[PDB]
Amino acid sequence: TDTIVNVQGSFFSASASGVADTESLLIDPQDAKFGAIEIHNIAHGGSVDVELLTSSDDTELVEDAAVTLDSFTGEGISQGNQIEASDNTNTYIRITNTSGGAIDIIATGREVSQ
Amino acid sequence: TDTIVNVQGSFFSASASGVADTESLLIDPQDAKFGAIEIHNIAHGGSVDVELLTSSDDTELVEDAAVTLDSFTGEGISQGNQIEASDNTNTYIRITNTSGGAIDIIATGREVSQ
Amino acid sequence: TDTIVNVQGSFFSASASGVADTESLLIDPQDAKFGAIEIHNIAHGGSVDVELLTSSDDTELVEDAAVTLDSFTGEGISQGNQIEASDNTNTYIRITNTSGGAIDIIATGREVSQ
Amino acid sequence: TGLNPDGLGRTAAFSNTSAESVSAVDATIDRLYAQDRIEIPTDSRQLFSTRGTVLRNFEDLSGWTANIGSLSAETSDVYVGSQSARLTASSSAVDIRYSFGTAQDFTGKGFSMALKRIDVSGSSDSTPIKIRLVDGNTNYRTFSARCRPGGGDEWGRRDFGFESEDTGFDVTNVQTMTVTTNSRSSIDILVDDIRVVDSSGTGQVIVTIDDVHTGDKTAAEVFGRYGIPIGLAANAKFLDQSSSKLTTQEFKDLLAKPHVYAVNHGYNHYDYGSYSIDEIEDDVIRGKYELQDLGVREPNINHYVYPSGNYAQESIDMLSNYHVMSWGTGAESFDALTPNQLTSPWHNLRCSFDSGTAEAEQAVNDAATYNQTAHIYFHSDNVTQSEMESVAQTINSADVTPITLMDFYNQQ
Amino acid sequence: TGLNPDGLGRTAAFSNTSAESVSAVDATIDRLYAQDRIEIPTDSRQLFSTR
Ligand SMILES: [Mg+2]
Ligand SMILES: [Mg+2]
Ligand SMILES: [Mg+2]
Numbered sequence: 001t002d003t004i005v006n007v008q009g010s011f012f013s014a015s016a017s018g019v020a021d022t023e024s025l026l027i028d029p030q031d032a033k034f035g036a037i038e039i040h041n042i043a044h045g046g047s048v049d050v051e052l053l054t055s056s057d058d059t060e061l062v063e064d065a066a067v068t069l070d071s072f073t074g075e076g077i078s079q080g081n082q083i084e085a086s087d088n089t090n091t092y093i094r095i096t097n098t099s100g101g102a103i104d105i106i107a108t109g110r111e112v113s114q
Numbered sequence: 115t116d117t118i119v120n121v122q123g124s125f126f127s128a129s130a131s132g133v134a135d136t137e138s139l140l141i142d143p144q145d146a147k148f149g150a151i152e153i154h155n156i157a158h159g160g161s162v163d164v165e166l167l168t169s170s171d172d173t174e175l176v177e178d179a180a181v182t183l184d185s186f187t188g189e190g191i192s193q194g195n196q197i198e199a200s201d202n203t204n205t206y207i208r209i210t211n212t213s214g215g216a217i218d219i220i221a222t223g224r225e226v227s228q
Numbered sequence: 229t230d231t232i233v234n235v236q237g238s239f240f241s242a243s244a245s246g247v248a249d250t251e252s253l254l255i256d257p258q259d260a261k262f263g264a265i266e267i268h269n270i271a272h273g274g275s276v277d278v279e280l281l282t283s284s285d286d287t288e289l290v291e292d293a294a295v296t297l298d299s300f301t302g303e304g305i306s307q308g309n310q311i312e313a314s315d316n317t318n319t320y321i322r323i324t325n326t327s328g329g330a331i332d333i334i335a336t337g338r339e340v341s342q
Numbered sequence: 343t344g345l346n347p348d349g350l351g352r353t354a355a356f357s358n359t360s361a362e363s364v365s366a367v368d369a370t371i372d373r374l375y376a377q378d379r380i381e382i383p384t385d386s387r388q389l390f391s392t393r394g395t396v397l398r399n400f401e402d403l404s405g406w407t408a409n410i411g412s413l414s415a416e417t418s419d420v421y422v423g424s425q426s427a428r429l430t431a432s433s434s435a436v437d438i439r440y441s442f443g444t445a446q447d448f449t450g451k452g453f454s455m456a457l458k459r460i461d462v463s464g465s466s467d468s469t470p471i472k473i474r475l476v477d478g479n480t481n482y483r484t485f486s487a488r489c490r491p492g493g494g495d496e497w498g499r500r501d502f503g504f505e506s507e508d509t510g511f512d513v514t515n516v517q518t519m520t521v522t523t524n525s526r527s528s529i530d531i532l533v534d535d536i537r538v539v540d541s542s543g544t545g546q547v548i549v550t551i552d553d554v555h556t557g558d559k560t561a562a563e564v565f566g567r568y569g570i571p572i573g574l575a576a577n578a579k580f581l582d583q584s585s586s587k588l589t590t591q592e593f594k595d596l597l598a599k600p601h602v603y604a605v606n607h608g609y610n611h612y613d614y615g616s617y618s619i620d621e622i623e624d625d626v627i628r629g630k631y632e633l634q635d636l637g638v639r640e641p642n643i644n645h646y647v648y649p650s651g652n653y654a655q656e657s658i659d660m661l662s663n664y665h666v667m668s669w670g671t672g673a674e675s676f677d678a679l680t681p682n683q684l685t686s687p688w689h690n691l692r693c694s695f696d697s698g699t700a701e702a703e704q705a706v707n708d709a710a711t712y713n714q715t716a717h718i719y720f721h722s723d724n725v726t727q728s729e730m731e732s733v734a735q736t737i738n739s740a741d742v743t744p745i746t747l748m749d750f751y752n753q754q
Numbered sequence: 755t756g757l758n759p760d761g762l763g764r765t766a767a768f769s770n771t772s773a774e775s776v777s778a779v780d781a782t783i784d785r786l787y788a789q790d791r792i793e794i795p796t797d798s799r800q801l802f803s804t805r
């Protein structure tokens with residue numbers, strides 16, 4: 001029969017260096033080519049809160065629904081997530097510093113079709 | 115041999131801000147393009163009961179079968195589930211507030227073929 | 229219906245023999261054909277720190293964000309991870325020796341589409 | 343979460359996991375929330391076996407003379423040392439005697455012996471065995487225990503309850519020790535290693551109620567009128583079966599009372615011989631966890647009372663993974679009675695007072711008089727309120743400390 | 755089995771698991787079959803030093 005090689009779907013990442021004490025990385029699925037994302041990894045650099053938000057606006061974040069998903073302490077990686085967001089459902093992931101000092105946040109995952 | 119890049123199938127989400135004390139988010143697979151869903155994530159904002167229902171009606175929820183899948187307490191996310199529902203099998207997922215006050219519920223997953 | 233055989237997407241590996249005490253294997257997704265990678269396996273020969281870095285430069289490593297993901301002790305393999313990096317997001321994985329002597333590092337995984 | 347652990351096979355780094363069952367070879371847990379042990383770390387079987395001092399070792403039978411029956415050195419089958427004494431008799435009792443080289447003083451001492459049944463038959467399959475002291479005046483004093491099938495099928499120490507005394511027996515001037523049985527068509531029993539333990543402390547009483555009958559409510563009031571503690575030997579399946587057995591809320595309410603405690607008696611009362619060791623182990627395990635869900639915590643739930651009093655070394659071996667101490671059954675005052683220091687927490691009995699209070703009230707008076715521990719039991723359906731009041735007033739008027747099973751095990 | 759526990763990172767609801775080695779920070783176990791302790795809770799070093 002027909003043989004096909006499956007290569008895995010588009011890589012996605014968001015990052016910020018030196019995120020100040022109460023500030024955040026906003027992971028926006030508008031930055032994806034397919035307009036939806038699934039974050040697998042959060043490499044957190046220090047303590048963070050992860051938060052999932054729905055916007056009232058199609059293009060900007062004006063908070064409607066907001067749920068604090070989890071809190072991470074110290075430096076490390078949250079591996080094996082499936083936190084999902086899309087542009088058309090106006091969903092955003094916010095990773096907020098809670099360390100008391102500046103940190104580096106890297107989030108990686110995959111683009112998903114809308 | 116032929117090489118293809120697989121991007122993953124359509125993102126699905128349901129959400130409600132300010133779900134009142136005993137009220138619910140009804141996740142309806144009729145809102146999916148493919149007419150079936152697999153919910154991976156329930157981010158719940160406060161305590162909830164998750165419930166899987168079959169309807170007597172093709173298009174509206176008139177309860178036939180109902181099973182309480184699990185109870186979640188406080189704020190957080192249940193991540194990486196596979197709770198599954200389709201339009202043609204008239205299956206619905208209800209997430210019911212049990213907090214004593216208003217909560218934000220975001221449910222995400224993937225569309226599945228019927 | 230049409231039947232296809234799916235073979236899995238391109239194998240990726242980086243390796244170094246005799247990595248000196250404080251030195252590192254720099255896993256660069258620029259070496260991938262698809263320009264992104266997912267490392268599953270780190271076989272480490274002695275103690276190592278695994279680190280995820282964003283570069284300021286499109287093509288060379290100038291550290292911007294850096295997060296130490298995890299520390300591995302003694303000889304063994306961390307198997308079935310999903311640490312991810314791409315060229316266009318300027319993401320690098322560094323595996324740094326911490327053993328007090330020379331080690332062999334083999335990292336394997338899969339190429340991912342950008 | 344971190345990266346995956348070192349190793350081949352399936353390895354995973356998780357944040358939060360839930361499981362019904364986890365099997366692990368190594369578990370490294372930084373903070374443990376596991377108050378409900380099923381398997382206990384302690385193996386009580388041989389801890390107490392070598393307390394006190396060996397009085398008669400039976401390692402040389404030159405000092406022993408058969409008054410009746412027959413005696414030999416058993417070298418093939420030995421509890422302790424080089425040999426044991428085989429006691430054999432036909433259509434008769436056995437009675438064997440050792441003369442002490444000087445007047446022994448046994449004030450405040452209690453007695454214990456190793457025993458194995460090979461065969462006993464006739465009017466019964468079983469016999470009282472009596473340690474029978476003789477004074478400088480040829481008065482006797484007697485302590486006794488029961489040789490039975492099952493419980494006696496392998497070597498196990500008995501700790502001897504007081505039984506009788508010839509009035510004016512001089513315990514400071516003991517001249518001969520005698521070991522003796524009832525008469526039977528066949529007797530073939532091995533003995534070894536008589537041990538002396540200090541029992542000079544106060545006499546003690548333990549009260550157990552079996553099988554969770556509704557009368558446990560009146561029992562709690564009655565024994566409560568003198569603050570005597572009750573052990574409910576509890577079967578968790580029996581709760582809410584019938585009007586005749588306690589409700590779950592009644593059982594919880596009972597255990598909230600400061601003198602009531604619970605010990606395991608198997609979820610569904612599976613007794614030895616009636617069911618396989620595996621079925622009894624499931625009954626033991628389920629009893630333990632169901633009672634733990636009802637709030638019965640560690641020192642209490644480390645005790646088990648044998649269902650229908652049936653046991654063997656097979657059941658003791660299995661039970662030792664889950665419990666530290668167990669109690670059988672008997673009809674007479676010496677069955678309740680032990681020294682305060684046990685040498686087996688597994689082979690000792692309890693006196694029933696279902697069939698009238700006499701032998702138990704004798705045991706309570708002897709516990710006071712001879713400085714011993716008495717374990718008495720009943721089912722609250724068999725016993726009238728006036729009988730309970732008789733026993734309760736016997737205990738309150740006697741010179742004994744009423745104690746829990748937990749207290750008794752902590753003293754060992 | 756139920757649904758997956760609260761949290762980010764890899765979370766899983768299992769029925770029966772087998773492992774060679776388990777590392778946990780918190781372990782909530784409703785019924786423990788672990789009679790064979792390696793690491794004992796008691797630190798005897800300084801208990802008796804002031805008898
Ligand atoms: Mg939008
Ligand atoms: Mg809100
Ligand atoms: Mg739109």
Ligand SMILES: [Mg+2]
Binds near residue numbers: 171173202203204
């Ligand atoms: Mg339908």
Ligand SMILES: [Mg+2]
Binds near residue numbers: 178179
């Ligand atoms: Mg129904």
Ligand SMILES: [Mg+2]
Binds near residue numbers: 202
């Ligand atoms: Mg239809």
Ligand SMILES: [Mg+2]
Binds near residue numbers: 316318
């Ligand atoms: Mg680049």
Ligand SMILES: [Mg+2]
Binds near residue numbers: 104293
């Ligand atoms: Mg930095």
Ligand SMILES: [Mg+2]
Binds near residue numbers: 286316
């Ligand atoms: Mg570029």
Ligand SMILES: [Mg+2]
Binds near residue numbers: 401420421424535
């Ligand atoms: Mg011997």
Ligand SMILES: [Zn+2]
Binds near residue numbers: 611650
């Ligand atoms: Zn019983």
